């Protein structure tokens, strides 16, 4: 059903998508020990999850003051949107993981380290992704089917994941947060460009779908960064990821609130994981 648009516009999920779907994915609370101690996360498994199939995986970080339970809590209800989108065929089934940057020495900035060493091997050894194994080689070999996103301070987390984890992750969804490395937007853009250079990847091998609200305070810092990134050769601006790799969706009137940001995920997540995919699909 899904077809890429070149300038996709903001559209909230129908109100009905905010209520429970009968085809409900299972949400599993997990606990693991890593470099920041013993911590928890939730794993959303799609309805019909079959461990003998391979699923895309999207890791999604909360904002400041929140935790690994927030996104599937009653304050957000993202699972209802996922369930309905997957049942209706708008979104291909995938695993969605909500970890936390709380605990131990962890911060929104440094979470990528724990992500690489602890979170990916824990989750992807248990559940069926494109990783045939969870050695560094096995994670890197499956990077086209792995994404990371997050809201606010979790948007900051996303940018640090991008800069430090291009080897492991191809799709990025920073929501209402900018990258804090640099004294100007050009410094931020240049850091990202240098990470890309170091990775050796082509422009067909990483994708950034950023979003915020036109009344969201984070726009002030995101917008200059996006414009600086658009000037790099590293990014081809368009939401058609069969043709380019960079988009910034700005929702008219929306403020810095999960009530809006959940809809950005609804709009953007369907755009992920079709480039070099293993099914024969026409988008
Ligand atoms: C990472 O980028 C951001 C994070 C926050 C966080 C706010 C909070 O935790 O209260 C606010 C921003 O713009 C105003 C922003 O650009």
UniProtKB/Swiss-Prot annotation:
Cysteines engaged in disulfide bonds, as pairs: none
The keyword Hydrolase belongs to this UniProt entry's keyword annotation: yes
Keywords, ordered alphabetically: Carbohydrate metabolism, Glycosidase, Hydrolase, Polysaccharide degradation, Repeat, Signal, Xylan degradation
MF term (GO), any: endo-1,4-beta-xylanase activity
UniProt KW Phosphoprotein keyword: no
Any GO BP: xylan catabolic process
Domain of life, per lineage: Bacteria
One term under GO cellular component: cellulosome
Family per similarity comment: Belongs to the glycosyl hydrolase 10 (cellulase F) family.
Name the UniProt record assigns to this protein: Endo-1,4-beta-xylanase Y
Recorded name of the encoding gene: xynY
Boundaries of the shown chain within the full protein: 803 to 1077 of 1077
């Amino acid at each position: 059903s899904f077809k890429y648009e070149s300038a996709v516009q903001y559209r909230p999920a129908p109100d009905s998508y905010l209520n429970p779907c009968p085809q409900a994915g299972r949400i599993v609370k997990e606990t693991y020990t890593g470099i920041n101690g013993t911590k928890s996360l939730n794993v959303y498994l799609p309805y019909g999850y079959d461990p003998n199939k391979k699923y895309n995986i999207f890791y999604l970080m909360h904002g400041g003051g929140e935790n690994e339970n927030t996104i599937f809590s009653n304050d957000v209800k993202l699972q209802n949107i996922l369930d309905h989108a997957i049942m209706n065929g708008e979104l291909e089934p995938l695993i969605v993981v909500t970890p936390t940057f709380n605990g131990g020495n962890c911060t929104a900035q440094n979470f990528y380290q724990e992500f690489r060493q602890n979170v990916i091997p824990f989750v992807e050894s248990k559940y069926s992704t494109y990783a045939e194994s969870t050695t560094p080689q096995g994670i890197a070999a499956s990077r086209m089917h792995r994404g990371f996103g997050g809201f606010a301070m979790g948007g900051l987390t996303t940018w640090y994941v991008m800069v430090n984890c291009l080897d492991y992750v191809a799709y990025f969804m920073p929501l209402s947060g900018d990258y804090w490395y640099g004294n100007s937007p050009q410094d931020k853009a240049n850091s990202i460009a240098e990470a890309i250079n170091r990775s050796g990847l082509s422009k067909r091998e990483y994708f950034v779908f950023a979003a915020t609200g036109s009344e969201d305070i984070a726009y002030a810092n995101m917008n200059p960064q996006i414009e600086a990134m658009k000037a790099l050769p590293h990014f081809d601006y368009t939401s058609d990821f069969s043709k380019g790799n960079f988009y910034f969706l700005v929702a008219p009137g929306a403020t810095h609130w999960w009530g809006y940001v959940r809809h950005y995920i609804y709009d953007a997540l369907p755009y992920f994981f079709h480039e070099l995919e293993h099914h024969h699909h026409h988008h």
